[PDB]
Amino acid sequence: MNKEILAVVEAVSNEKALPREKIFEALESALATATKKKYEQEIDVRVQIDRKSGDFDTFRRWLVVDEVTQPTKEITLEAARYEDESLNLGDYVEDQIESVTFDRITTQTAKQVIVQKVREAERAMVVDQFREHEGEIITGVVKKVNRDNISLDLGNNAEAVILREDMLPRENFRPGDRVRGVLYSVRPEARGAQLFVTRSKPEMLIELFRIEVPEIGEEVIEIKAAARDPGSRAKIAVKTNDKRIDPVGACVGMRGARVQAVSTELGGERIDIVLWDDNPAQFVINAMAPADVASIVVDEDKHTMDIAVEAGNLAQAIGRNGQNVRLASQLSGWELNVMTVDDLQAKHQAEAHAAIDTFTKYLDIDEDFATVLVEEGFSTLEELAYVPMKELLEIEGLDEPTVEALRERAKNALATIAQAQEESLGDNKPADDLLNLEGVDRDLAFKLAARGVCTLEDLAEQGIDDLADIEGLTDEKAGALIMAARNICWFGDEA
Numbered sequence: 001m002n003k004e005i006l007a008v009v010e011a012v013s014n015e016k017a018l019p020r021e022k023i024f025e026a027l028e029s030a031l032a033t034a035t036k037k038k039y040e041q042e043i044d045v046r047v048q049i050d051r052k053s054g055d056f057d058t059f060r061r062w063l064v065v066d067e068v069t070q071p072t073k074e075i076t077l078e079a080a081r082y083e084d085e086s087l088n089l090g091d092y093v094e095d096q097i098e099s100v101t102f103d104r105i106t107t108q109t110a111k112q113v114i115v116q117k118v119r120e121a122e123r124a125m126v127v128d129q130f131r132e133h134e135g136e137i138i139t140g141v142v143k144k145v146n147r148d149n150i151s152l153d154l155g156n157n158a159e160a161v162i163l164r165e166d167m168l169p170r171e172n173f174r175p176g177d178r179v180r181g182v183l184y185s186v187r188p189e190a191r192g193a194q195l196f197v198t199r200s201k202p203e204m205l206i207e208l209f210r211i212e213v214p215e216i217g218e219e220v221i222e223i224k225a226a227a228r229d230p231g232s233r234a235k236i237a238v239k240t241n242d243k244r245i246d247p248v249g250a251c252v253g254m255r256g257a258r259v260q261a262v263s264t265e266l267g268g269e270r271i272d273i274v275l276w277d278d279n280p281a282q283f284v285i286n287a288m289a290p291a292d293v294a295s296i297v298v299d300e301d302k303h304t305m306d307i308a309v310e311a312g313n314l315a316q317a318i319g320r321n322g323q324n325v326r327l328a329s330q331l332s333g334w335e336l337n338v339m340t341v342d343d344l345q346a347k348h349q350a351e352a353h354a355a356i357d358t359f360t361k362y363l364d365i366d367e368d369f370a371t372v373l374v375e376e377g378f379s380t381l382e383e384l385a386y387v388p389m390k391e392l393l394e395i396e397g398l399d400e401p402t403v404e405a406l407r408e409r410a411k412n413a414l415a416t417i418a419q420a421q422e423e424s425l426g427d428n429k430p431a432d433d434l435l436n437l438e439g440v441d442r443d444l445a446f447k448l449a450a451r452g453v454c455t456l457e458d459l460a461e462q463g464i465d466d467l468a469d470i471e472g473l474t475d476e477k478a479g480a481l482i483m484a485a486r487n488i489c490w491f492g493d494e495a
Contacts, residue, residue: 001053001054001055002054002055002056003054004054005024005049005050005051005054005056006051006052006053006054008023008051009021009023009024009051010051017125017157018121018124018125018128020051021051022121022124023051023121024049024050024051026117026120026121026124027117027118027121028047028049028056029046029047030113030114030116030117030120031047031049031114031117032045032046032047032049032058033045033113034103034106034109034110034113034114034117035058035101035103035106037106037109037113038101038103038105038106038109039101039103041060041072041073042070042071042072043060043061043070043072043073044060044061044063044070044073044092045058045059045060045061045098046058046059046061046092046094047059048094048097057097057098057099057100058097058098058099058100058101059094059095059096059097059098060072060073060094060095060096060097060098061073061092061093061094061095062074062075062091062092062093062094062095063075063091063092064076064086064087064088064089064090064091064092064093065088065089065090065091066089073095073096075091075093075095119191119192120192122157122192123158123188123192123193124193125157126156126157126158126192126193126194127158127186127188127193129156129157129158130156130158130186130193130194130195130196131183131184131185131186131195131196133184134184135182135183135184135203136182137180137181137182137207138180138181138182138183138195138196138197139154139178139179139180139197139265140152140154140160140173140178140179140180140195140197141153141154141178142154142173142174142175142176142177142178142179143175144159145174145175146161148164149161149162149163149164150162150163150166150167150172150173150174151173152173152179152195152197154195154197156195158192158193158194158195159189159191159192159194159195160173160179160194160195160196160197161189161194161196162179162196162197162198163198165200165230166181166196166197166198166200166201167179167181167197167198167199167200167231168199168200168230168231168266168267169200169230169231170231170232170267170269171231171267173197178265179197179198179199179265179266180197180199180204180265180266181197181198181199181200181201181203181204181266182198182201182203182204182207183195183196183197183198199231199263199265199266199267200230200231200266200267201230202226202227202228204263204266205226205228205230205231205234205263205266206226206227206228206236208234208258208261208262208263209223209226209236209251210223211262212251212253212258212261212262213238213250213251213252213253213258214250214253214254215250216250216251219241220240220241220243221238221239221240221241221247221250221251222237222239222240222241222242222247222276223236223238223251225237225327225330225331226327226330227326227327227330228271228327229322231263231266231267231269232267232269233269233270233271233272233323234262234263234269234271234272234273235271235272235273235274235289235323235324235326235327236251236273236274236327236331237273237274237275237276237283237287237327237328237330237331238250238251238252238273238274238275238276239275239276239277239283239331240276240277240278242278243278244277244278244279246275247275247276247277248273248275251273252271252273259271259272272289272290272324274286274287274288274289274324274327274328274331275289276331280298281296281298283331284296284298284305284332285309287328287331287332288307288309288316288317288324288325288328289324290313290314290316290317290324291307291309291310291314291316291317291324291325291328292309292310292311292312292313292314292317292341293308293309293310294308294309294310294341294344294345295308295344295345296308299334303334303335304334304335304336304337305329305332305334305335305336305337306336306337307325307328307336307337307338308344309338309344310341310344311338311339311340311341311343311344312341314341317338318338318339318340319338325338348375348378352371352374352375353371353374355374355379355382356370356371356374357370358382358412358413358416359380359381359382359402359405359409361412362405362408362409362410362411362412362413363381363401363402363404363405363408363409365401368396368397369396369397369401372395372396372397373392373395373396376395377392380392380399380402381401381402381405381409382405382409383405383406383409383410384402384403384404384405384406384409385406385407385410389402389403389405390403423449424446424449427449428449428452428454429446429448429449429453429454430445430448430449430453430454430455430456430458430459431454431455431456433455433456433485433488434448434455434456434459434481434482434485434486437456437481437484437485438480438481438484439476439477439478439479439480439481439482439483439484440477440481444472444477447470447472450467450469450470451466451467451469452466453467456482456485456486456488457485457486457488457489459482459485459486460482460485460486
């Protein structure tokens with residue numbers, strides 16, 4: 001008997017940290033592989049080694065395949081008539097059984113084989129605590145230096161590595177600093193498994209909403225959306241949970257008690273969050289702070305918003321580098337458009353006539369009925385089946401002609417498409433040779449009228465600036481789409 005496998009399994013400072021059978025399962029197999037490598041025969045070795053009573057032996061695998069793989073102890077259909085028809089491709093049964101191999105030469109090559117085996121065994125326990133929480137508050141102290149990254153000789157029986165975009169770029173996890181963030185994907189790094197500290201992503205920057213505020217973690221403050229730069233600045237909508245109170249000091253701390261502590265472990269930067277309230281107009285105005293709001297408006301007929309603010313002292317409201325308004329839409333849910341301070345009131349300069357022309361032509365009206373309330377009511381008569389026409393009594397004339405625009409005025413909008421629908425079929429458009437080819441969608445070929453293409457071979461003449469007006473001409477939309485169309489002269493007409 002071995003009389004030492006039991007002691008190895010019950011050392012038990014290192015054996016009991018991992019599974020008790022790990023040493024007899026993985027380390028034994030690695031030792032068998034090392035002994036086989038030290039042996040002349042290049043045969044797969046499986047270690048039937050147990051720490052119960054010392055019954056440890058080795059076996060030579062058969063490697064039953066359709067070839068001569070592992071030829072030292074290979075198996076195949078050459079023994080089909082002798083092994084009760086056990087011919088297959090992939091079977092790894094034990095053809096033979098070794099007795100013992102002291103292998104003093106393998107004891108010398110231990111530093112190359114068993115050292116790596118012990119490293120893998122340690123990594124097995126390292127991965128059990130590196131990122132086993134699948135994303136939680138994981139800290140790390142930096143004690144090592146690594147190229148192209150930031151190393152940390154932290155605990156959890158493992159190391160830690162932070163990429164350039166993982167930790168704070170201004171102050172990486174280097175000697176003289178520490179990190180604290182969240183991570184879930186931890187693979188086997190150099191010298192065994194390692195943890196990961198990334199205190200720059202949303203999972204660490206936005207996690208301060210319930211770690212810095214004193215009345216948010218108990219679900220008393222509205223903290224549901226927060227977009228911020230990594231370790232540089234943060235501008236989130238600090239609101240109350242339908243309390244209609246001043247929340248500017250809730251998530252930012254009383255007298256600035258949390259501005260310098262939200263990301264203290266992530267780099268220690270200064271943030272400027274925006275405020276909100278229960279009023280939708282006030283919340284929309286204050287969600288993009290600092291924004292010089294000049295008017296109040298809201299749009300719901302389309303998937304868009306309206307950022308009605310100035311741009312003189314509110315350069316962040318329009319967006320110069322994504323400082324304040326970039327996280328504003330996340331607090332609203334709809335994308336908004338902004339302009340200059342004097343360009344905010346010019347959104348409907350010529351629109352009040354452009355949209356009203358199609359309503360006056362359809363209803364056969366004049367300027368008196370086309371411009372009386374066009375600038376007052378946005379789309380007063382434009383597909384009036386949904387919009388109401390019972391509030392224009394004070395306007396010049398009755399709203400009955402505008403009320404009758406639910407279907408009478410919708411016929412003109414379809415009859416005017418006579419110069420647009422026919423332009424996508426044969427009016428200087430692509431031919432049928434590329435209208436049903438692969439690479440692009442069948443209906444996507446109708447948008448080829450903006451490049452001047454008249455046939456399959458005509459679309460290949462577009463250079464870097466001919467058809468590049470739109471972003472449709474992508475890599476996947478041109479590398480495999482025009483290949484079956486423009487190659488008619490090269491290899492298309494030849495069967």
